[PDB]
């Protein structure tokens, strides 16, 4: 039993609701909710510029500390860092984003690094302005990850088209 409070169930460990990622991950303070990151982690826009907003700017010092040792992610890779606020930890994932011409079949990629983690509250992976479909983000999540995954979806028009549309 855990805390996350009105999602429908699409399999035995995906489940979706239509919520704001920032204010469900401060309701619910999850383990680690999951960034949609670039590999700079340049938290300028979409989820990962709302949830660095959140944390008043706290994630991005952290992350551009991590940068400088580290370098860039790869694209369909992810790092650990604080969660700050609004989870223990957050999953920075790099999803493909279509806008920059990236590869769509690193997107099952990106979704792997959720099996390192037993529960996480996520957005839809390369969803938004990372410019790909966001039914075929759904399914490749279904068919990818294992572990419990909670997927807040901001759009209401898209979180409807998304549950009508799901085989
Ligand atoms: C289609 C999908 C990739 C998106 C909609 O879920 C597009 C728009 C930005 N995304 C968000 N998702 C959940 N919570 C959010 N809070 C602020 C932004 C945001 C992802």
Do not use: W
């Amino acid at each position: 039993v855990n805390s996350f409070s009105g999602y429908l169930k699409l399999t035995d460990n995906v489940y979706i609701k239509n919520a704001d990622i920032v204010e469900e991950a401060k309701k619910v303070k999850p383990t680690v909710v999951v960034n949609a990151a670039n590999v700079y982690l340049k938290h300028g826009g979409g989820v990962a510029g709302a949830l660095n907003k959140a944390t008043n700017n706290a994630m991005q010092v952290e992350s551009d500390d991590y940068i400088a040792t580290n370098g860039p992610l790869k694209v369909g890779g992810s790092c650990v860092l604080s969660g700050h606020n609004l989870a223990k930890h957050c999953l920075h994932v790099v999803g493909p984003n279509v806008n920059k011409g990236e590869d769509i079949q690193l997107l099952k990629s990106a979704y792997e690094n959720f099996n390192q983690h037993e529960v996480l509250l996520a957005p839809l992976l390369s969803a938004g302005i990372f410019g790909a479909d966001p039914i075929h983000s759904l399914r490749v999540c279904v068919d990818t990850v294992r572990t419990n995954v909670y997927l807040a979806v901001f759009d209401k028009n898209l979180y409807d088209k998304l549950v009508s549309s799901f085989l």
